[PDB]
Amino acid sequence: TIEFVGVEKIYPGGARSVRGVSFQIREGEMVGLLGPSGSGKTTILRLIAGLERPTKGDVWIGGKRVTDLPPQKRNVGLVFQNYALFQHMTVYDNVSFGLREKRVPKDEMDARVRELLRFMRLESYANRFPHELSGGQQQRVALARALAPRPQVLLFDEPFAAIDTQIRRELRTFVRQVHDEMGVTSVFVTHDQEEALEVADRVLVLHEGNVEQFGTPEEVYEKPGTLFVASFIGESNVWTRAVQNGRIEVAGAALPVDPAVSEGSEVAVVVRPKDVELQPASEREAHAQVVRSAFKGSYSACWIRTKDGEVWEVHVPSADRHRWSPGAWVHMNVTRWFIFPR
Amino acid sequence: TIEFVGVEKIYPGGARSVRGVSFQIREGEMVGLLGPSGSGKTTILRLIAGLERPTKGDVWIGGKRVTDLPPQKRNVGLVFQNYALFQHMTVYDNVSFGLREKRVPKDEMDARVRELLRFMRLESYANRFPHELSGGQQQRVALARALAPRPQVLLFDEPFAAIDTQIRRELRTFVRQVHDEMGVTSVFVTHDQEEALEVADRVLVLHEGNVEQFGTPEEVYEKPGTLFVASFIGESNVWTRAVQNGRIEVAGAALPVDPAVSEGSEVAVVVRPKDVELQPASEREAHAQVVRSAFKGSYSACWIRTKDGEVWEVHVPSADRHRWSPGAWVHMNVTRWFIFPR
Ligand SMILES: [Cl-]
Ligand SMILES: [Cl-]
């Protein structure tokens, strides 16, 4: 339902620039705009809202060129951190606000509102004012207000920041359940790759104002298109190695390098913490020495320092929470990896 | 090096109250004060700093009663979000600030500063001003300034908020490496249980101004002292069940209940997402129906809805990323659990 055609919006300061972007978001899809602060992800969200206008290129929604139409003129609803519930209005009135302008007759406006309130578990709070509710409940009300008018597109601008970690997690699960229910098209901004993998159908990875990759969680995690995607999605150990005899040396192992990479050129080897296995050994021949471990529930995190001074992060099964002690010497076993040209 | 003795500081509004707390933090230990917003965790950090004073009880540091001593009078350094590097001073001068007041002669102040700068990889930035550095580098400078005077205690008040997820993670790994190096005693505030498990030696779980538990990451995760600890550390599915015939029914399984829990009383069953196994089945006898799955790298997250309408979150191995499709019917297998009295 959304499309950017060679959209460009450059800021002389760098951050926030969008550098000639094009993509197509499917109807009913939930897309996460994932990137570093100032990578262009927020500008893109704002370009879809109409809060910003492209210097070149166009924005389409529902096959409808809306590049020059204001926010009010687009079929999109906003759930922004920039927002604020009407503090002196009850939950009921905050939510009816949108229907209030579509000239919907009283009876139908009412049924629409009651509909949204029960769906979102806010019936017991209809006659309450925003200050009487928890932040969590206030976000449910904001999503109800945005949805009332039946928007075509739903835009989220990190509305859950300044929230406690646990409530933030319950919220994203709620927003997802609501999305699947309302069948709308949703786009959200985030600098947290875990959040993107968790709720998005597809992820748009942004970097320096360009789209690095646009794919499913599995796609961006298992088949990263660039070193940036490889290093920004999931966790990773990233190091430089020089190619010699068609291979690089990683932990006493020769990793073959694609023949298209020239002898003597440098590459980044990317190895995920879970993809490295540790086995006891003597300092004599050991690859690394354990700095320390941390039990994280589903797995134990183990940091080790190689002979060359590289500190690697390795994830071992919970069933090994007590296997590696500080100072201990160990052998490494890289099992999966990525290799990208520097 | 730190001890609270029946410390009490109550706020008429609830949030921030500390309700009769006592604990002992070991020398060279890194402790995480983990709790919901307003649970008393920040007030406690401030009580150690001297920024706040207890209404009752006392605070000890290094076996030294300091309850009535100001921040300046305590052997503690601050790395707060409330802070701000001196923008018009170079990195070198920002860091020498502390030594500057211990009347340390020029030569020795200089060697101390150069010492800290090289340790923290800020030598190439000595003659730069704060605005010339990334936020990440600015935090390294703040930690250097706090450490210059050789504080006994190091206090962190969520200094990494308003930071990108990836840099926040690199920062905590750095703060930990520094801590292990300087051998100081450190306390940090956090509402993120994952962060606490990752870097703390022991975690102080706060709730409504009381200490729920004080133990190692493994302790609080595997042996939660209360339902709150069980539901606040790690991930969990939490549901109520009534006891009948000395057991509760969870997914077609009878979980025995400790004989000390009376017939007819209600309990909370806590089951971690990773501790539930799914196997195909007919709707006829199936326990749940898959709402959806999300690939998260090391594991696939699967949400299912039971016949009774409970939506459970289950974590299945990456090796099963494509095994469960929406609508699909399934059988559940709870393998580990906790049971606490409601
Ligand atoms: Cl941006
Ligand atoms: Cl607090």
UniProtKB/TrEMBL annotation, chains A, B:
Residues 2-233 form the ABC transporter domain. One of its GO terms (cellular component) is ATP-binding cassette (ABC) transporter complex. InterPro entries: AAA+_ATPase (IPR003593), ABC_SmlMolc_Importer (IPR050093), ABC_transporter-like_ATP-bd (IPR003439), ABC_transporter-like_CS (IPR017871), CysA_C (IPR041193), Mo/tungstate-bd_C_term_dom (IPR008995), NA-bd_OB-fold (IPR012340), P-loop_NTPase (IPR027417). GO terms for molecular function: ABC-type sulfate transporter activity; ATP binding; ATP hydrolysis activity. Keywords: ATP-binding, Nucleotide-binding, Sulfate transport, Translocase, Transport. It comes from the Bacteria. This is Putative ABC-transporter ATP-binding protein. It comes from Alicyclobacillus acidocaldarius subsp. acidocaldarius.
